[PDB]
């Protein structure tokens, strides 16, 4: 794998982020997390939603570097989104979610799992710590 460079444009939830990428405007759907909802398909705006998404959005947006890092699969989804890792100065965006207890590793798709192992361990120390989602 290897990470490539971005620039922001706009964040849109704690799961979804738009960036310039290889010249084009595309949203990111972050892979293998899965974070409350501020504007849920269904619900509304669940708990931890305002939470998880400020926090993805103050990390891109304090960022002196954004990198993007596709995985071995496909990397769009069905609605266009690019699926990658993303990365803010070097600290990947999705395990800080989840080590922060405001993701859950997400059901995951082969071969679309290079890092869930790592996410696994981290979402365990939150569990364990009692952060957030899951105090």
Same mark, same amino acid.
Do not use: C
């Given at each position: 794998?290897?990470?490539?460079?971005?620039?922001?444009?706009?964040?849109?939830?704690?799961?979804?982020?738009?960036?310039?990428?290889?010249?084009?405007?595309?949203?990111?759907?972050?892979?293998?997390?899965?974070?409350?909802?501020?504007?849920?398909?269904?619900?509304? &705006?669940? #708990?931890?939603?305002?939470?998880?998404?400020?926090?993805?959005? /103050?990390?891109?947006?304090? @960022? =002196? !570097?954004?990198?993007?890092?596709?995985?071995?699969?496909?990397?769009?989804?069905?609605?266009?989104?690019?699926?990658?890792?993303?990365?803010?100065?070097?600290?990947?965006?999705?395990?800080?979610?989840?080590?922060?207890?405001?993701?859950?590793?997400?059901? &995951?798709? #082969?071969?679309?799992?290079?890092?869930?192992?790592?996410?696994? /361990?981290?979402?365990?120390? @939150? =569990? !364990?710590?009692?952060?957030?989602?899951?105090?």
């Amino acid at each position: 794998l290897h990470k490539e460079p971005a620039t922001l444009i706009k964040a849109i939830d704690g799961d979804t982020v738009k960036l310039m990428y290889k010249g084009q405007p595309m949203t990111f759907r972050l892979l293998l997390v899965d974070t409350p909802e501020t504007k849920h398909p269904k619900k509304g &705006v669940e #708990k931890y939603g305002p939470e998880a998404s400020a926090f993805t959005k /103050k990390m891109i947006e304090n @960022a =002196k !570097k954004i990198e993007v890092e596709f995985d071995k699969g496909q990397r769009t989804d069905k609605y266009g989104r690019g699926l990658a890792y993303i990365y803010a100065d070097g600290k990947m965006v999705n395990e800080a979610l989840v080590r922060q207890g405001l993701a859950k590793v997400a059901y &995951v798709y #082969k071969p679309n799992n290079t890092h869930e192992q790592h996410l696994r /361990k981290s979402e365990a120390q @939150a =569990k !364990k710590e009692k952060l957030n989602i899951w105090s």
